[PDB]
Amino acid sequence: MKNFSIAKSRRLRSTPYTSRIEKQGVTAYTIYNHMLLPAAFGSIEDSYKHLKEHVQIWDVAAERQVEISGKDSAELVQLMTCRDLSKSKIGRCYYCPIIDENGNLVNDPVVLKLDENKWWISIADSDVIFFAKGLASGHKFDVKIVEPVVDIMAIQGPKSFALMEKVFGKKITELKFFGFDYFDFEGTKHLIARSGWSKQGGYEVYVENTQSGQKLYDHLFEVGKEFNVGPGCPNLIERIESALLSYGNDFDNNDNPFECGFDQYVSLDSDINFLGKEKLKEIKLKGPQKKLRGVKIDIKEISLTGSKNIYDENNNVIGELRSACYSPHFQKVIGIAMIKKSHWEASQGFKIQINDNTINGNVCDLPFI
């Protein structure tokens, strides 16, 4: 077969939005945190153009929460991340790389500080819940760790702001990037952050009252018509062009923050203690020997289902291409590659096998645009 069906089960969890997106034209799924996440609503290029010009509503329920509350919650949260959260404030979001005893990445979540003793970790694709529960028991912390009933719906694109003002009023227009607050929809208060996995702008509604959230979803489609609202999902071309890097895809647990361009979130000269702090000091001293870079390959098509070695002018492996797509902006293929320090340099050339043909490519900086 060219395509394989996804086999549904209780274990591969549906969302509060599933029956709706399946009537609105979802054509492919990925799995993220043991949950269905839409991967396409037809053409990925057309979804990208629509996202950059209009507004979309996304089922991103699979961006699960780990809720950590109780006396040692602030501390357990800070143990897990190399980002300094000592001056953190209620109502703010912070991108906090989670790292292990080796200094290697576990997850790149957004942390929401709801209160001094209550923390939501909005996670990428790995079971941070169990890392937390492991660390809590091992370090003897007094916390409560749950996956709460929270199912995110995103509102993304340049028309997101006008659409959400229409629904929630002028108060939501005051929300700064990566702030959150509580907003009323027909009696129910919903936590809404100004965040989301694009650079086109918008919001994420952290739906706890599921029924009210489903009615809100339906309402956004009804009063969004004048804005050309439509369904969507995180967009492959957008995430590569803007270097919105994802755990499991661009980097994984054999990679450290310094190989992924996360230098500014690794806070080594505080007195806060987090995992692998010592090992990350050594890495920052000797410097990394490999790093995520962009690449361009002058072909009009690619379908990356997995990794692919890239080779030098002698046919020695100089890196690994990890994500890639056709970019209409460049009218060629662009990607994210973990490349050896020998070939880091913006403009450095390389060779890669696409089918049975060597083809040339070149390294570039991230983001692409």
CA 156, 35, 108, 251 torsion: positive or negative? negative
CA 260, CA 105: separation in Å to the nearest integer?
10
CA 68, CA 125: separation in Å to the nearest integer?
18
> How distant is the alpha carbon of residue 114 from its chain centre?
20
CA 243, CA 120: separation in Å to the nearest integer?
24
Whether the bond between 367 and the residue before it is cis, its omega within 30 degrees of 0, is yes
Radius of gyration of the chain (CA): 21
Q: Which residue positions form the known binding site? A: 122, 204, 206
| Most distant CA atoms of the chain, gap in Å | 67
From 11-19, 67-75, 197-205, 349-357, span contacting Na ion (CB under 5 A): 11-19
Should residue 245 be labelled a site residue for Na ion when binding is judged by CB under 5 A? no
Should residue 152 be labelled a site residue for Na ion when binding is judged by CB under 5 A? no
What is the smallest separation between the CB atom of 126 and a copy of itself, expressed in angstroms?
A: 5
- Which of Na ion, a copy of itself, none has residue 59 at its interface (CB below 5 to 8 Å by kind)? Na ion
- Which of a copy of itself, Na ion, none has residue 40 at its interface (CB below 5 to 8 Å by kind)? a copy of itself
Nearer to Na ion, 55 or 61 (CB): 61
Should residue 204 be labelled a site residue for Na ion when binding is judged by CB under 5 A? no
- Which of Na ion, a copy of itself, none has residue 130 at its interface (CB below 5 to 8 Å by kind)? a copy of itself
DSSP label of 179: B
Under the phi-then-psi rule, with left for phi > 0, alpha for psi from -120 to 50, and beta for the rest, what region is 77?
alpha
What is the smallest separation between the CB atom of 342 and a copy of itself, expressed in angstroms?
A: 23
Under the phi-then-psi rule, with left for phi > 0, alpha for psi from -120 to 50, and beta for the rest, what region is 25?
left
What is the smallest separation between the CB atom of 124 and a copy of itself, expressed in angstroms?
A: 9
From 13-21, 47-55, 251-259, 308-316, span contacting Na ion (CB under 5 A): 13-21
What is the smallest separation between the CB atom of 149 and Na ion, expressed in angstroms?
A: 14
From 2-10, 55-63, 102-110, 241-249, span contacting Na ion (CB under 5 A): 55-63
Q: Which of 119, 110, 77 is nearest to 195 (CA)?
A: 110
CA 369, CA 352: separation in Å to the nearest integer?
23
CA 44, 47, 53, 55 torsion: positive or negative? negative
- Which of a copy of itself, Na ion, none has residue 8 at its interface (CB below 5 to 8 Å by kind)? a copy of itself
Q: Which of 199, 233, 159 is nearest to 368 (CA)?
A: 199
Should residue 37 be labelled a site residue for Na ion when binding is judged by CB under 5 A? yes
Nearer to a copy of itself, 150 or 193 (CB): 150
The residues that touch a copy of itself, with contacts defined as CB under 8 A, are: 1, 3-14, 22-23, 26-31, 34, 39-40, 100-101, 106, 125-140, 145, 147, 246-250, 253, 275, 303-307, 322-323
Q: Which of 213, 157, 152, 141 is nearest to 180 (CA)?
A: 152
Q: Encoding tokens for residue 345?
A: 């340099």
How far, in Å, are 63, 178, 317, 355 from residue 153 at the CA level? 10, 16, 42, 39
What is the smallest separation between the CB atom of 103 and a copy of itself, expressed in angstroms?
A: 12
What is the smallest separation between the CB atom of 206 and a copy of itself, expressed in angstroms?
A: 21
Q: Is 50 helix (H, G, I), strand (E, B) or coil?
A: helix
Should residue 62 be labelled a site residue for Na ion when binding is judged by CB under 5 A? yes
- Which of a copy of itself, Na ion, none has residue 62 at its interface (CB below 5 to 8 Å by kind)? Na ion
What is the smallest separation between the CB atom of 38 and Na ion, expressed in angstroms?
A: 7
Should residue 59 be labelled a site residue for Na ion when binding is judged by CB under 5 A? yes
Nearer to a copy of itself, 243 or 304 (CB): 304
Nearer to a copy of itself, 33 or 88 (CB): 33
